[PDB]
Design a protein around this nucleic acid. Structure first.
Lengths: 121, 121
RNA sequence: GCGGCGGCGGCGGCGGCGC
RNA sequence: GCGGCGGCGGCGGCGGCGC
């Protein structure tokens, strides 16, 4: 299937996660995000260290155009449900609606992402 | 039960909603929001016409302090799930997490509300 | 971090019924 | 707008199992 994401997954192995735990969510290795279209879900764990360079990098993981290319594989006459989810430091935000509204869903999803990743410590 | 909201509900009757439909979501009468703490959910339909005065009014419907007073009725040793939901013009945003994180949940909820209600037409 | 599992609650599509 | 209903899929608590 063609993914909505433009960066690959970065999930930590079990060992890497333990080591990180032993040496320090709040300062997790990163955040989790996902895009769902009908019954298909695409998922990413991305490293994030709360700097400006890193924020810039992880905001590039999807665009309205990558999301639309991916989602449109699953479109037809009827509307399907589309959902964006992100979780970081104990907070989950889900942006959801029908595919007819995807352009607005992407606009609110990107804003939600930015705000959550910049949440005051 | 003590509500997290500081404005009363404004749900339209069936007739008022029909009339509004016949004379004009996109330009709905308002938006729907809700606060959930464990298994109890409080809900509001509030009128909103996309002006600055109206935005100011509906942003007063809850505060971090009203939410905390309401939610704390349901607190104890274990953590419970807390969720804020809002829907406007075909887009739903849910902000969710545990009660230990309520202060952050309120910060992201208020930002999500503002952004959604100001969504470019 | 990943994969089951059991409860509880919410959210989005879709179809349909009542007011 | 409100109240059922049937599917499908996500999400959050909680408990627990595997790597």
């Amino acid at each position: 299937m063609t993914s909505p994401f433009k960066l690959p997954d970065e999930s930590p192995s079990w060992t890497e996660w333990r080591l990180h735990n032993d040496e320090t969510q709040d300062n997790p290795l990163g955040f989790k995000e996902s895009w769902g279209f009908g019954k298909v879900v695409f998922k990413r764990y991305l490293r994030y260290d709360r700097t400006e360079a890193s924020l810039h990098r992880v905001l590039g993981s999807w665009t309205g155009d990558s999301v639309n290319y991916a989602a449109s594989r699953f479109f037809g006459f009827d509307q399907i449900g589309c959902t964006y989810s992100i979780r970081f430091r104990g907070v989950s935000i889900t942006v959801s609606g029908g595919s007819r509204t995807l352009q607005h869903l992407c606009e609110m999803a990107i804003r939600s992402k930015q705000e959550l990743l910049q949440l005051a410590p």
